[PDB]
Amino acid sequence: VIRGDEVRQIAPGQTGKIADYNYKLPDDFTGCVIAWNSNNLDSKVGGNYN
């Protein structure tokens, strides 16, 4: 699960904190990437810290 502006940086060759230190794709990646909005189910009224 990723913050909204940080979805665009999951692409191979792209740089970003989640890409740099969490999960970056290889330069010759062959696959599909899928994402959708989950505010209604994952977010919490006072905040979710899990």
Binding site: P12, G13, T15, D27
Partner: protein
């Protein structure tokens, strides 16, 4: 014969300083200044020219 061989060899050596449409003709500058996932677009054209 001697002059025509020497001039051909010298011209062959001189071609190493050409740019061939890259941003610079120094390989180390290309590999150090730019990013790995996009620096290959210069390396291939330099290789084709040489």
């Amino acid at each position: 014969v001697v002059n025509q061989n020497a001039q051909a060899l010298n011209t062959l050596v001189k071609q190493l300083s050409s740019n061939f449409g890259a941003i610079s003709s120094v390989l180390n500058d290309i590999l150090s200044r730019l990013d790995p996932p996009e620096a290959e677009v210069q390396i291939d054209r330099l290789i084709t020219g040489r």
